[PDB]
Design a protein around this nucleic acid. Structure first.
Lengths: 91, 101, 96, 78, 79, 97, 103, 93
DNA sequence: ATCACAATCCCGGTGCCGAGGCCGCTCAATTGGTCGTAGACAGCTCTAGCACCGCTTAAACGCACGTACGGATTCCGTACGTGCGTTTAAGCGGTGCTAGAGCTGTCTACGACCAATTGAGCGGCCTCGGCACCGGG
DNA sequence: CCCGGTGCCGAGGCCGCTCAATTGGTCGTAGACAGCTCTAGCACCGCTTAAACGCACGTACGGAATCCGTACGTGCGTTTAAGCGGTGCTAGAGCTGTCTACGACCAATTGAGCGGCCTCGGCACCGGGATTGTGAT
């Protein structure tokens, strides 16, 4: 069995565009793309945890990793979406 | 209810949490909201790329997003251009003929 | 009936800046990669996807290098690119 | 030699794609040397990755890993 | 003003160390803009690293880590 | 009035500054610039002195490398005097925005 | 009886091992012969840079390696220049003036 | 508030190659940072190389391949030679 | 060519901080022995990579021809470079003060794990609808 | 470049199986925290040489202009080997099982590496002849 992000991309696409499908090569492109962003965020979070000597990885490590990686308005809006998700999840 | 459903995200919060455990810490803990924040970030970035690519495809009048459309959308937006410095197979080049020519 | 320099060049520029196809014959490039890897480890095999990926990467690399070289040449108030422009691009990029 | 397999029209086509109007006649040997060096680097890294896994077939993933190592990450081939 | 404090003789000395023999009259403002952009880029990460530790003092290590992030690793202030 | 020829004193300065290794900016103005830059990102900050010292080392090394690239660009165009356009070409070739 | 003495090195096998286990992923294990290799590698690299910088210092007839000698040794060899791409603090540059400027 | 550093072993190596040539505290800081950076690079590559092959143990094979991946030609040859010598000496005892 | 002349290199004394040595001691490398689990060694099968044949036929290739373009030459105009009298803002040095880093001793909230359930996620498959090459204006 | 014709393979929805995401009870443990101490960041003055700033001035330099010679681009006819297809064949990539051989955990313990204290010797700051490129003759 080979794991993939093929779902959660078809769903996001069918929600942003209720009428546009995606091919099989573009699916590989976006699998690799999501994998790369996840790798970068995970690495930065691990490095922050090692820097500040906190054994656990909290939401704050993710927040600072997003702020360091993503530039400008992208970072701001991504941080907003993450905080919205966390606030909804806690309740 | 699924953790993704409670978090209100389409991405797998549980699977992302497992991946964070198996790829991101020496010997330690991953907070439960860490997976929620990571999934929300991934969802946002993917949604932005998908919206831009779909806009390009609609401008080109086609019902499928292809690597050419992904390349057009990625290079078009400044923030996405700065975030993604990779090579896209079958993506081509953006036309730009210099004025001096 | 003939043409003059700069016409067919721009026509080809437009015709090749819009497509997505590969711009090297696949068999000669495959022979090249097999010969290059014939010294690191003898009796080696490859995969079709591996050689295709190597070709895509090399094409992207050379197109980017030619963009940088064209900028370097246009800097000197020129239209023709020469080895000095390539060497300048690769020295500034740190590739040497 | 198979480095000559990069024919003159191929180099001219890459140059046209890049936006080059005129091309000196000495450009071709320089581009052949450039391509040979780049291929040598990537192929060495991918062969080391393959040899680590006790293998005799260079798949696409080895090439993608080698390309990512140099800072030239490639999407959509593994 | 606080950006003219990087004076014309200072930019001239920085240029001379690079091997520059003649300097145009517009080089100074361009180099001031370049330096301001670079300093903003690195300090935007130094302050973020400091904030993540709930601190008010920007220790040298925050700057060194921020520099290593941008691919300009600096030797002699950490380790 | 010895009145050296224009150009023969610049080479001596080149030799002198490439032989020396100290810092080449007054410390107080660079400290003030760093404070003014970091003020807008977050108010009421405080700096270890080594923070500003490392920042100045980084800035000087960056500018020296950039000027070497600009000199190469200028010598390319059959010139002796570096120009803003050569700085721009250098910063464009190496990808720095 | 110490592990590094058993491997015949100067760098510590034990501390390097302990620092390795702090970097491997969850459930990661560090072979006791990985620390040996890493200690040998670090010793070799340090020995190379030290020999280069020492020679650069004896060129100037001094007894103290400083940042200047480290930069002169790093940028004076192609391998170390390619491997080390850092900013040695207080190292200056390598003195070199082009030929299109000299009268 | 103990702080650990690679200074003692750096000094031992320096006295091994240059017995009568010293080192400055600024150079000691430089070389502390150099050893730290190189070790971090090698360790990260070894970890990723173990991860790719679906392993969990970081063996000397992983370190050897990491050195071969981040060290230029002749440096790679000599470093791998030294590491192999050390490992076959250690396994002897 | 030959040479005055500012500037650079070349040695020399000096005293002043920093490198290198030396103890005290606390922390952490090291020894020894369970048990357990990841990983090496042996088999199996069938996927997919190497090899050979023949067509054909789209791309490379070698020669002919002429024109646009890069290189040398010439001429000034001016914008950088040199030197100097003068001022302004850095550089120490000492005193005064204290915000905030840094350690500690509690403890209380979060996260890893296990038994069990079950519900979402991949491999098949069965099609029809976006599409790519036509062919022409 | 801009609309049709057409036969298609590519994308997508339905289907059954499986494996990992979700409760739920422990439970050991890490970081929020309040407090205390004390360093080092910040502020203010005072002199004191020194780098900056503005100005006069004459030379090298960037930039436009003119002019030939030539070497890249364009066209044509003729190879020439790349691309398809078809069939053979087997070499090892990938999955399964088994058995063990190193690496983790725990307890006691002992030496190695930090922190502080101290001293002479190397690097720095400079005075005085030696000699060396410069610029006008």
């Amino acid at each position: 069995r080979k794991e993939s992000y093929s779902i959660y991309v078809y769903k996001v696409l069918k929600q942003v565009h209720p009428d546009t499908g995606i091919s099989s090569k573009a699916m590989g492109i976006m699998n690799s793309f999501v994998n790369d962003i996840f790798e970068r965020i995970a690495g930065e979070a691990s490095r922050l945890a090692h820097y500040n000597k906190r054994s656990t990885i909290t939401s704050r490590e993710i927040q600072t990793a997003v702020r360091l990686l993503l530039p400008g308005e992208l970072a701001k809006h991504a941080v907003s979406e993450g905080t919205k998700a966390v606030t909804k999840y806690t309740s | 209810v699924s953790r993704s459903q409670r978090a209100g995200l389409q991405f797998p919060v549980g699977r992302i949490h497992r991946h964070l455990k198996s790829r991101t810490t020496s010997h330690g803990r991953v907070g439960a909201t860490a997976a929620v924040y990571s999934a929300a970030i991934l969802e946002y970035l993917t949604a932005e790329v998908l919206e831009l690519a779909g806009n390009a495809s609609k401008d080109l009048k086609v019902k499928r997003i292809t690597p050419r459309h992904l390349q057009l959308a990625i290079r078009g937006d400044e923030e996405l251009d700065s975030l993604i410095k990779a090579t896209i197979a079958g993506g081509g080049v953006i036309p730009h003929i210099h004025k001096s020519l | 009936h003939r043409y003059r320099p700069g016409t067919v060049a721009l026509r080809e520029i437009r015709r090749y800046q819009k497509s997505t196809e590969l711009l090297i014959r696949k068999l000669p490039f495959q022979r090249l990669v097999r010969e290059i890897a014939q010294d690191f480890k003898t009796d080696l095999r490859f995969q079709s996807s591996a050689v295709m990926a190597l070709q895509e990467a090399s094409e992207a690399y050379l197109v980017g290098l030619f963009e940088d070289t064209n900028l370097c040449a246009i800097h000197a108030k020129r239209v023709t690119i020469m080895p000095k422009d390539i060497q300048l691009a690769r020295r500034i990029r740190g590739e040497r | 030699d198979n480095i000559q397999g990069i024919t003159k029209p191929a180099i001219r086509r890459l140059a046209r794609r890049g936006g080059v109007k005129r091309i000196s006649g000495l450009i071709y040997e320089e581009t052949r040397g450039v391509l040979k060096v780049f291929l040598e680097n990537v192929i060495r890294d991918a062969v080391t990755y393959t040899e680590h896994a006790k293998r005799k077939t260079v798949t696409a993933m080895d090439v993608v890993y080698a390309l990512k190592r140099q800072g030239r990450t490639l999407y959509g081939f593994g």
